[PDB]
Assembly symmetry: D3
Homo-oligomer: 315 residues x 6
C-alpha cells in the first residue's frame, strides 16, 4: 500500500471551517494555531470547498487573507496547501523559471519524475494558470542537453505499455555502455533516448543488465560521464525508477542540510506528496538516515511554519 | 405555472425567415414592421438559426445589418433579442462597468438574483465574449462592501440544498440582529455571510424568525443599517427570495417611471425573462399596479421600439 | 473671442482640494455640493493634480471613490470631468461602439467634427486606454458608406493647408452636382472624397459655389441624395464647416428635446467643449431657440446632476 | 470506391522509424532517400506517432530537424506531410493571407470545397495555431463580393440534409437566371445565396433545371456574368458539386502548366487529398488529360521533391 | 560623500571581457573565479556592453549561459549584476508577488524607500519587462491598509518641493497624534497621507514636532498603533527619512541574522546599492554592529557565492 | 556614386495621383498600365502620401484595393512597392518563417547583409507589424549554428567603427585558420565571432591576411569547412564585405535561373534596393554576366509584372 499522511476530516463541514478560519484572523492578532489545525487536518479536496465557502461568506478570497495575515515560510506553506495539486506544481515551475535565475533542481524534481498522465495534467494547469505553453517557457530558461531532456519529459511520450524484455534490455544497456563508458567521448542523446522512452519496468531491467556488463552501476556511469544539470536530470530518472521514495527522501534530507533550509524544496515535497506516498517516503527516510523525517523537520524549521509542516507529515 | 411570453414559432423555416429579413432591408426603405414580426414571434433558439442562415446566404451578419439599418432603442432591443441569453447578460454586465461610470443597479439586478448554476453560465459566457474574468472586471469598477457582495455572488456558492430549519434560522436571525440592530456600529460581513450562503427556503425562514426578535422587519433593519449600493444589493436579495416576480415587477415600474424611461433596464428585463417567467411577472405587475404591463409600455415608449416591446410582452 | 466657461481656479492648492473631496465622502453621508463645487470650479488640468494628490494621500483613486459614492447621471457627469479630454472622447467612442447596439450619432459628433490633430490625439488616447486600434473597432461596428466615411475621418488626412480657391471650388461643386443631382443614380464616393480632404475654408467656398450652379443648397442635395447614417455624417461635416457653434447648439437642443434627455450627449458636449467654445455655443444657443442653454438645462435636469451641469455651464 | 493513395504501413513501429529518421540526419550528409521513404510510406496518423517518439527520444521536434536539414520545395513537401490534416489547411490559409500579396485561388481551393464539418475543423485548427479568428483574418485581406463568399463559406451553414425537389430547384434555377442572364446588371447576392446554402444533391438538381431554361450551362452562365476572384469562387462551388475529382484534377493540371510550377498548390492538393480521394483524382486526371498524374509530376518536378511527390501519388 | 563600491574598470575592452567569459565556460569545467572577477570588477554599464558583445560574438546570450553553467545563490547573484538597475528592481518586484505567497518585506524595501523619480523608473522598467502595469499586480497580491500605502508609493506624487515649516509641521504631527495615541480607534489614513505626501525635510520637522507633544517618538507611536505589513511599511518610510544608510544596514544585518541568510534580500541590497551608497552603508553597518559588513558576509556565505559578494562589497 | 534607380516625381501631387489610381480601378476592368506608371515613377515617400490621400478620399486602403483588383506576381510587386521599406523587410522575414517551412535564403539575404542601424529598424518594424519579437520567431524556425549566426546578426552589435589594424587582422586570420583548415574538427564559434563583430574594413584586411597563411581564400575555407545554411550565411557576410553589389547581382542571377523564377527573391531585391544602390547593382550585374539586368528581367518575366519590374529597374 502506497499512501499519504493527510486524510479527509470525518464529519466535514466546510461552512463551519470557513467561519473557524474567519475567527482566527478577525481583529488584532492571528490564531495561527487555529489556521494550522484546519489546513493540516483537512484534505486538499475539503480545502477547496472551504475556500469556496469563505469567499461566498465574506467576499474575500482565503488566499488573499492569508497573504495579508501570514508571513514567510508559514505563509508560503499555508498557501501551498490551498493550491489544487496540479496548480501547485504548475506554479512551482513558474517560480522556478521566472524568479531571479533558474531553480534547476526544482525543474528536475517536477519534470523528471512524472508519468505521462501526470505530466499532461501539469501542462494543462500551467496553460490554464499563465496562458502560456510550459515547453515554450522551459526552452527560454534552459539550454543544451538539459533543455533537451526537459523537452523530452514534456511530451508525455514514455512507452508506458512496453513490457519487461531482458533481451532488448540487454541491448539498450550495451548501447548505453557504448555511448558513455566504452568510449572517450559521449553520445549523450543515447542516454536521453533510452531514459525518456522506455517504460519504468523495462528501465529497471535495463539497469540490471547494465550492472552485468560493467564494473559500475548505471548510476556511477552517469555520475562519471556527465556533470551539472544534465547529470542530475539523468540521475533523477534512474532513482525515480528504482526507488521514488528514496529519491524524495534524499531530496528532503538535502533540503534540510546544515544551518539553513531550502524551504521551497521542503514545502513542495511535503505538500505535493502529502496525499500520495508521504507515508512510504517517511518509512524510507527513516531506514536511510536512522532519524525520523519529523525530527529532521522539527530541528530544521521554526515557529508556526515548523508546526504546520510537522502536522501534515506525521510522526 | 411559471413561464414567459415568447414560445417557438411552429412550421419554422430559418432560411425563409432570413430571406424575409433581407427583403425588409434591401433597396430604399426599411420595413421595420416585418423585422419586428420575425424577431418578436420567433424564439431565441430559432433566432440563432436565422442568424446562421442569414450569414450563410448573404456573407454578412444579421447583427451588422441591423447596426446599420436600425437606430436608437429599436436597434438595441432588436440586437438584444438576437443575443444568446447568457451572452446578453454578459454584455449587459460588461456595459454596466466599462462605459461612463458604473451602472450599479444593473450589476445588482444581474448578480444578486441568480442561482448558482445561473451565475456560472453567465461567467462562462462573459469569458467567452471578452476573454477576461468577470470578477476581475467587477473588482475594477466597484469597491468596499458592495464589491465584496458582488464577489460573493460571483462564486455561485449558495448552499442551495440547505433545508428549512427553524432552529438554525433563529440562530442566524439573532446573528444578523446583533450585527446590525443590536449594536452602535455594524457587522456588514454577517449580513453578507448569511444572505449569500443560505438557501432561499431557509432564508425565507430566517426573515420570519427575525421578525420574532425585532420590531423592524429584515427589510427595515437593512434599510436602517446601510446606505447606497450595499443597501440596495442586500435588499435585492431579500426581495428575490420572497418574490422574484415582485422584484422584477418593481424594476419595470421604476424603469418606466419618471417623465422618461430607463430604456436600458426595460429591454433587459423584457428580453432576458421573455422565455422564463415574464408571463408571471405580467400577472404580478397588474396586481401591484392595477394597470397591465403592456398598457404601461404602450403608454411609455413609441414607434418601432414600442411595437417590438409590445409584441414580445403580449397583452 | 473663442473660449470656454470653466476657468482655472486661482490660488490653486491640489492637496487642499483633495482633502476637501475626502471630507465630503468620509463618514455616513455624501456632501455632493462640495464635490460639485471643487469639480466645476477647477480646470481639467487642475483636476488631474487633485486626482494625483488624492491617490497619494489615501491609496485609492478619486474616480473609484466616485464610482462608489455617486450614481446615475451625477456619477457619470462627475467622472466625465475627471477624464483628460482625449481620454473622455476615446472612452465615449468606446461606449458608443461596445454597448448594446451602435450610437452612430455619437460617432458622428466625435469623428465628423474634429481637426487632424484632434483625431490623432483621440486615436492615441483610445489605444492607450484599450490597447485596440480605433479604426479596427469602428470597422467592426459599422458598415457600408458610413463605415468608409468614418475611416476617411480616422486618417486625419484633411488638407488643412489648402487655401481658398474659387476656381477649384467650382470644379469640386460641379463634380458633386454630377455625383448626385446631375444623374439618376449616385457616385457617393465623390461626396466622401471632397468632404473629407478639402480644407474647411475651401469647403466653405465650395458650398457657396454649389448654390450658384444648382437650385438646391448642398445641404438639401445631401438630404435628397442619401438616407440614414451616411446622410447625417455628410450633413454634420457641412454644418461643422459653416458653423461649428450651431452644430453643437442643435445637438444640445435635440438632446434636451421632448420628454427625455439624451444625457450622455448632453454630458458629452457640455464637458468636452467646456474649456474650448462653450461660451460661443451658449451665445448661438440663445440666438436659435430664444432660451439660454442654462435655462434649458435647469428645466430639463434634476438634483446634483442638474447643479453640476449648471455650474460648469454658468449662466 | 473513393479513396486515397497512402495507406498505413504494415508492422508499424514508430520508435524504429524515429530512430531511422535520426540516422538519416546525424553526422555527415543527409539521407533524403530514407527520409522520403519513411514519410511517404507511413500514414499521416503514423507520422504523428513518429513525431512524438522522435521528440521524446531526442528532445528536439522532427519538424525543426527538417527545417534545418532540408531545403526548398523538398522541405516544404516533407513538412506538409508531417502536419495533421486540419492544421495543414489552416496553415495553408494563413500563408495565403499573411504573406506579401494574397493567394486568392488558394483561399478558393480550401474554403469553397469543404463540408460544414470540414470547415469547422479547419477553423478550430486555425484558432489553435494562431490565436486568431479565421473569419476576422479573411475579412482583413479580401473585400467585396469575394469577401462575402468566403464569409458565407466560413459559417459551415450549408443545409446538407436538404432533399432534392425538382419544383424548388426550378424556382432557384429561374432565380439565378434572373440574377444574371435576365438583365444587363447583376444580382450577385442571389448566386451567393443559392450556391452557399443548398445541399449538394439539390444544387445538382438546380444545375439541371437551369439548363432547361437557358442556352448556357450554369458554368457558362457564371463565366459570362462574373470575373476575377468571385467568378472563380462561384465556379469552384459548381465544380465541387458536379465533379469534385474533376476540380482538383483541373487545379493540379493548372499548377504544372506553363513555364514553371505552382508548387504550393501542387503540394497542397497532393498532400491534403492523399488519404481521401487522390486515387479517384488520379483516375479523372488521365481521363481528362490522357496522361497520368504521375507522368505530369515526373515531367514537372525534379530531385527529392519530385521523388517524394511521385511516391505519395503512386503510378 | 555618498558613493558605491564598484567603479568602472580602466582600459575597458568589452570584446575582450566577453572572450574571457567564453573561455571560462567552454569545455570540461567552469572557471567561476574568472567569471567572478569580470562581473565584480566591471561596472553595470560595462557589463551591458559585455552582454552585447558576448551575444554578437557567439549567438547565445550571456544570461542564458550563466543560467546553464551556474547554480544556486551564485547563479542568482551573477545574474543580478547583469540586470540593468531599473530592470533589476522591477524583476525583484515581480518575484516578490508572483512566486508562492508574497515577499512583503521585499515590497517595502523597494516601494517605501524611493524618490518620485526612482519610483517612475521602476514602473517603466516593469511595464517594459512584463507588459503589465505594476500597480495592477500589486493590488492583486496585497490588500487592506498595506495595499493602500503601496498604491500611494506608486503614484510618485510626494510634494518634494514642500519647504520645511514649523507651523504646518506642528499641525501634521498633532493630526497624527489624534489619529493614533490621542484616540481609542485609529485613523490609519492620516498616517498614510502625511507619510506619503510630505517632502522628506518637512517629514523630518514633523517628527521633531511629534516629540514636542508626545512622550513617544514617531516610531514608538507607530509601533504602538499598528502591526504587521502596514506597520513595517510606515516605519520604513520614517527610517528612510531619518537615515537611509541605517535602514539598509539593518536589513542586511537581518538578512544574515539567523543561522540563516535571506539570500534574496542580501543579494538585492548589495547589488542594488553597489553603485550608489554601499560605501556609506558599509560605514554605517560597522558603526551599528562593530563588525564590518564584509566579515559579516564572509562568515555567512560560502563558495563562489560569497566570493562574488565579497568582491562587490570590498573590505 | 552609390544610388538607387527610383527618384521622386517632379511636380508631385498625391491627391491627383490617388485620383488617377481610383480611375484605373473603377468600373469595367482595371487600367494596370496606369497603376504601374504611378507606382514605378513615384518614390516610396511619395507613395506613402498617395496612400494616405486615397484612404482619406475613399475610406478604403489602397493596399486593400490592389489585393482585390490585382493578382499573382503583379499584385505582389505593387504591394511591395507600397510598403514602407523597413516594414517591407519585416514582412519578408515574417513570410520566410511563418509559411510552410522556412525560406532560409531570404533570412540570409536580409539578416546577414545589414548595418547595425538597418537591423534595429527592421526589428522595430517587425515588432510594430506583428506585436512580436523578431529574435524569438527566428529561434522558433531555425536551430544549431545557423540559428546562432542569425541571433548574432540580430544584436546589431558589429563594431562598425573598428579601425583597420594589421596586427589584429593577422591574429584574426590565424585563429580562423586554426578553427577550420588548421585542424581535423572545427571551431565554428570562431568563424561566427570574427565575421559578426569586426568592421567591414577590418574584415577586408583579415581576408587578405588569410591568403598569406593559406592556399585557400577565406571563401574557399568556408566552403570546405561547412555545408548548408551556416555555410551560406558565413559566405554572404564575406561576399557582402568584398562587394555587396555583386552579392545582390549574384542572387538576382540565381533567382532568374532555371526554367522558372523565384519571383520572391527578384521582387525583394529590386524593390528593397531601388532607392539605395540598385544603380550600382545593375553595373556590377552587367560586369559579371555581360547582359544587362534589364534584359534578364525582360527575358524571364511576363505581363504587367515584367512591366513594373522593368520600370523600377530602368535600362
Ligand atoms: Ca528567471
Ligand atoms: Ca565516454
Ligand atoms: Ca467605465
Ligand atoms: Ca448597528
Ligand atoms: Ca455595436
Ligand atoms: Ca443621384
Ligand atoms: Ca497578404
Ligand atoms: Ca503570489
Ligand atoms: Ca489609538
Ligand atoms: Ca514556417
Ligand atoms: Ca578542421
Amino acid at each position: 500500500v502506497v499512501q499519504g499522511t493527510v486524510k479527509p476530516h470525518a464529519s466535514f463541514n466546510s461552512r463551519e471551517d470557513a467561519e473557524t478560519l474567519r475567527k482566527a484572523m478577525k481583529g488584532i492578532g492571528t490564531d495561527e494555531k487555529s489556521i494550522t489545525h484546519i489546513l493540516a487536518t483537512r484534505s486538499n479536496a475539503q480545502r477547496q470547498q472551504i475556500k469556496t465557502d469563505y469567499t461566498t461568506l465574506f467576499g474575500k478570497h482565503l488566499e488573499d487573507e492569508l497573504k495579508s495575515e501570514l508571513s514567510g515560510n508559514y505563509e508560503a506553506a499555508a498557501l501551498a496547501l490551498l493550491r489544487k495539486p496540479d496548480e501547485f506544481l504548475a506554479e512551482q515551475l513558474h517560480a522556478a523559471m521566472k524568479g531571479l535565475g533558474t531553480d534547476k533542481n526544482a525543474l528536475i524534481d517536477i519534470l523528471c519524475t512524472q508519468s505521462n498522465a501526470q505530466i499532461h495534467a501539469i501542462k494543462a494547469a500551467f496553460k490554464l494558470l499563465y496562458k502560456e505553453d510550459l515547453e515554450k517557457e522551459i526552452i527560454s530558461e534552459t539550454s543544451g542537453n538539459f533543455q533537451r531532456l526537459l523537452v523530452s519529459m514534456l511530451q508525455g511520450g514514455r512507452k508506458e505499455d512496453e513490457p519487461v524484455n531482458a533481451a532488448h534490455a540487454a541491448e539498450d544497456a550495451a548501447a548505453i555502455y557504448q555511448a558513455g563508458e566504452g568510449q572517450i567521448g559521449t553520445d549523450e542523446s543515447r542516454f536521453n533516448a533510452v531514459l525518456a522512452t522506455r517504460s519504468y519496468p523495462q528501465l529497471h531491467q535495463i539497469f540490471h543488465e547494465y550492472s552485468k556488463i560493467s564494473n559500475k552501476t548505471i548510476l556511477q556511469a552517469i555520475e562519471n560521464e556527465f556533470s551539472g544539470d544534465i547529470k542530475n536530470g539523468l540521475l533523477a530518472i534512474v532513482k525515480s525508477v528504482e526507488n521514488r521514495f528514496a529519491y524524495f527522501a534524499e531530496r528532503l534530507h538535502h533540503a534540510m542540510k546544515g544551518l539553513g533550509t531550502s524551504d521551497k524544496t521542503l514545502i513542495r515535497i511535503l505538500v505535493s506528496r502529502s496525499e500520495i506516498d508521504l507515508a512510504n517516503i517517511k518509512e524510507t527516510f527513516q531506514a536511510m538516515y536512522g532519524k525520523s523525517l519529523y525530527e529532521f523537520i522539527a530541528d530544521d524549521c521554526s515557529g508556526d511554519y515548523k508546526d504546520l509542516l510537522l502536522q501534515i507529515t506525521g510522526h
